[PDB]
Write a protein that binds this DNA or RNA. Structure first.
Lengths: 144, 167, 185, 60
RNA sequence: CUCUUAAGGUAGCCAAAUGCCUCGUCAUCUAAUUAGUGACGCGCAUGAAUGGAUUAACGAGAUUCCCACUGUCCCUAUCUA
RNA sequence: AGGAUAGUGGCCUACCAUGGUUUCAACGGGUAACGGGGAAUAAGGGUUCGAUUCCGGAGAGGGAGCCUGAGAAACGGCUACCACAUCCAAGGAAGGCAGCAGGCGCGCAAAUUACCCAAUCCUAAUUCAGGGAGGUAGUGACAAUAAAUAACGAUACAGGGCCCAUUCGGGUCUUGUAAUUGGAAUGAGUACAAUGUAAAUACCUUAACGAGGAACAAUUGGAGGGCAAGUCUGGUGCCAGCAGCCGCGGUAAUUCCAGCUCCAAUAGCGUAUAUUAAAGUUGUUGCAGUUAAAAAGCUCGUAGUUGAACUUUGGGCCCGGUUGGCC
RNA sequence: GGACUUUUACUUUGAAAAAAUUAGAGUGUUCAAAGCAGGCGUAUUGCUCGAAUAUAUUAGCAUGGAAUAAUAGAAUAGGAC
RNA sequence: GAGAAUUUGGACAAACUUGGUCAUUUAGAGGAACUAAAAGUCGUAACAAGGUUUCCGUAGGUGAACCUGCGGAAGGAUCAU
RNA sequence: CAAUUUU
């Protein structure tokens, strides 16, 4: 037909041919080479807790504005260095200094979304206080 | 975690982060810190430590009213804004780092409460927007300049330009 | 260790998630019957879509086999037996033709309005779960029941539990003392 | 970049919004009674069709 | 652009057998190294057949380190001609 | 040929010979690789898992050797070495929780120093003993299944099924509206007796007390598109913030923060990561190769794959076999 | 029992493919997930049906067909009864 | 005859030392890249024939894109004597 | 034939 030989006794020249041309997939190499935890600072899983060394603040690119106020966190298990991001109407005062703090990824297989450069993660709770319950403050602040 | 339960290992020891960015432990005496700090190397963390004298609050203050008011040299193509300052007193400083007048406030409130018993006039909220750092720090401006040439920008770029170089 | 318990979930949501002419055909269907949520109109359409998934593979089979003969005239016996498919459709292809309101007419809450007896379909939910009407003699507080052709010649109220008698109902125990020493003594 | 977030600049539109107290309405139904209630709102007493149909006619 | 009296250190290289300031500064080697090494270079005063940069073999060439070996030392004793 | 085994054999030794596998992928390396029955996904063909309710293999800190015994290279048996390691009078002894509990450390991550042989089996010298095997509980929004959060009216108002007329609207009912009310009904509860059980809790029953919105109180998202739903209003004005994507915000934002209203799923609801369908964006069934990524510069060539055709048809006769038909 | 039929691929049937889970008959766990039970006689010391069935690849194991895809003996006749 | 210590010789060899080889992680003064944000400073090679037609190999120079020599090709600015 | 920029 077009290459790809239609011999009846010809399985191996189509079976070596498949998983030779399987390496071109954008995610198949990150499956079996194990690359998901030789970088990308978890063990190929959801979350980990870090430590607030200090914070910082980035201004976005064009066309965008309104500095986005991220935080500087070193992570617990590999000593790797990636920052976080704090999405609320404030609560940067709520995440105080030198706390343990739980992380989460932005959804797009890493790959910082459209306008926050140099970021990889967001925060789901800070020393187990569930800042969703403190931004929309349906909680007190337990001790931190 | 190790000093999170050395905090509760002894019913007087207070263990906290000093606001100059360093951890501070307090003993009742002078060998208490040695029997404790050997029991941080032992049983708790296992890692060598530095045991330093602490550092303190070095906050300085402009002197009387700063009579000498000479020129500054900025230039980038055109620019000229410069300045000379004077203190505000200790009773109004204590009256601003408590939460009695701080921004979010009404301008007639902070303008006439400025003239209740503070020595100042009633004309200091059409002479500033609000203040900082933190909306707390004892650092105020007064708009004693002339008629403005449509420069709304110097009420956000100057509060943004105001912690620096003040911090 | 003792045995694994075997259990399955019984509903599967549609795959285009939400649009107007799908949701409006829900709300007029599931609202005039007036049912709880989409957990049950999915779960009858679940097993509806699975028995047709069963049926049209023995329909792929020919007759004179075992399976299109043996169980083929057994579920079409059973669809007669559950009261859903009427006594004129023993033809092995009309089971593929039936659809909703026919797995709904033979539940409790719809069928009990059809004998009068309930004044509404939403009184007919209060008619069921508040320890009221039996079927032959055993009592039933479950609306999605699948009446099997033989209780509807015996469906009445409970032996106890008024509008059904045998005890005059016991908010009138609260309205005994508020009837006795409130209308005199 | 290096620190210019300037936490005086923070959630300021949380700070300067005027928050009134939330109101108090009668209790809406639930269960099947709320799905009873929205049944009649579509094809029984459809209020203002303004050409063909509109569900919530914001006043204009 | 610019001035001496013509053109102003290019590729390379280094405290090197050329660098007083000098025991320059950094990392390694050892308990300790002004000696080594590998980097830095606005080099008092490096540099292109007054040849620059490398380089296998070789050297009674200069130099530092390591393994084995020993009266070089601790700490000397003894014997023979 | 001999040894040794419980028993064949390079399983080990003496002698002799030079072989054995391999582009149908040997050998080496990786495995976050115990194998299988099996899961999740679902037009067909699949893809990714499977440490774990069963089967079988291995291990009892790490290796090694061991006597007893039918059966151990046992580890709730032993000896030695390493690495841990616990006591003490310093002289010496003492071990192996990856059995059940409970702790530590790690981590994003996971219960109770609970009771009982009463069930189901096993064990012995054996109908009686025993078993953290196992079972009953406790914690338990891992996953699942059934379905509370209310009827049903009256009144009054407004509309039209509806027979009428200039009804100044009279009638039937209808559908919504209202805190103006009504007399009904019941478990969510609580809790006698009973049942259950090794025992007791809890359900299945069931006394007697127990419902009018606030109390016997449903939330999690969302409202420019994809994507169902607010051109409603206030605050902010490239700030604060949002937004998976596209974009919003620069003095009324239909995307921001709130108040109302609405849409969604609903006792569950979003988020985060790895997955399968969607993806005919991996393709045998089923891709593309002039210009979008791609056809070797061209020609030999062993593989391997694929390879012109023809080698006994046509019958006739008999026999019974099934199914749909027969005035 | 002698005897030896070129050698396979394919395909029909049967056997096998532990069992639970996936299907699937039956069966009012009050319904369902589920279980595999039950159902009725006199209640004067009892009658009885069940606990189905199917898939379970490939490798073998026997079992018919000879189209399809290959295969071999009579060129020097050391051919054949 | 039983028989404890002791004891010769063989095998099993735990453990240990020295040499390699391979894999896995990891510290390291400094060097040489690459990416991103647009605010820039020198120019304007590319898009028109971009004003010297343009592109591919290759050799040489060149602050910088670049330029130039050769053999090609039209993806051109000619489907034509 | 001289010819290069233009937020």
């Amino acid at each position: 037909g077009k290459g790809k030989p239609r011999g009846l006794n010809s399985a191996r020249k189509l079976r070596v041919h498949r998983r030779n041309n399987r390496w071109a997939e954008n995610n198949y190499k990150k499956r079996l080479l194990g690359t998901a935890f030789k970088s990308s600072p978890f063990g190929g899983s959801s979350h980990a807790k870090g430590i607030v060394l200090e914070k910082l603040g980035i201004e976005s690119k064009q066309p965008n504005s309104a500095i986005r106020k991220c935080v500087r966190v070193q992570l617990i298990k590999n000593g790797k260095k990636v920052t976080a991001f704090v999405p609320n109407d404030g609560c940067l005062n709520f995440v105080d200094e030198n706390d343990e703090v739980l992380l989460a990824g932005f959804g797009r297989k890493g790959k910082a979304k459209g306008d926050i450069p140099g970021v990889r993660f967001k925060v789901v709770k800070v020393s187990g206080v569930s800042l969703l319950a403190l931004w929309k403050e349906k909680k007190e602040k337990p001790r931190s | 975690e190790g000093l999170k339960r050395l905090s509760k290992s002894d019913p007087c020891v207070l263990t906290y982060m000093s606001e100059s960015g360093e951890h501070i432990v307090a003993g009742t005496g002078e060998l208490h810190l040695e029997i404790c700090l050997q029991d941080l190397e032992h049983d708790h963390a296992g890692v060598p430590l530095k045991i330093s004298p602490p550092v303190v609050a070095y906050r300085e203050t402009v002197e009387s009213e700063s009579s000498q008011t000479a020129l500054s040299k900025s230039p980038n193509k055109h620019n000229r804004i410069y300045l000379k300052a004077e203190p505000i007193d200790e009773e109004v400083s204590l009256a601003i780092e408590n939460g009695i007048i701080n921004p979010r406030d009404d301008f007639k409130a902070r303008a006439r409460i400025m003239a209740d018993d503070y020595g100042w006039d009633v004309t200091d909220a059409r002479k500033i927007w609000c203040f900082g750092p933190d909306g707390n720090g004892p650092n105020l401006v007064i708009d004693q300049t002339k008629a403005v040439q449509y420069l709304h920008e110097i009420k956000d770029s100057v509060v943004a330009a105001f912690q620096w170089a003040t911090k | 260790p003792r045995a694994p318990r075997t259990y399955s979930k019984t509903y599967s949501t549609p795959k285009r998630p939400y649009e107007s002419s799908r949701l409006d055909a829900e709300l007029k269907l599931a609202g005039e019957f007036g049912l709880k949520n989409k957990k049950e109109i999915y779960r009858i359409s679940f097993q509806l879509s699975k028995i047709r998934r069963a049926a049209r593979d023995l329909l792929t089979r020919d007759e004179k086999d075992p399976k299109r003969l043996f169980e083929g005239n057994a579920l079409i016996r059973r669809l007669v037996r559950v009261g859903v498919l009427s006594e004129d459709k023993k033809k092995l292809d009309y089971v593929l033709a039936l659809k909703v309101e026919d797995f709904l007419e033979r539940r409790l809450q719809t069928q009990v309005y059809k004998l009068g007896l309930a004044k509404s379909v939403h009184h007919a939910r209060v008619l069921i779960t508040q320890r009221h009407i039996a079927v032959g003699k055993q009592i039933v507080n479950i609306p999605s029941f699948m009446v099997r052709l033989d209780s509807e010649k015996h469906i009445d109220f409970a032996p106890t539990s008024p509008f059904g008698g045998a005890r005059p109902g016991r908010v009138a125990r609260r309205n005994a003392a508020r009837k006795a020493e409130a209308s005199g003594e | 970049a290096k620190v210019h977030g300037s936490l005086a600049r923070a959630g300021k539109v949380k700070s300067q919004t005027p928050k009134v107290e939330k109101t108090e309405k009668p209790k809406k139904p639930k269960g099947r009674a709320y799905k009873r209630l929205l049944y009649t709102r579509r094809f029984v007493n459809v209020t203002l069709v303004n050409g063909k149909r509109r569900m919530n006619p914001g006043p204009s």
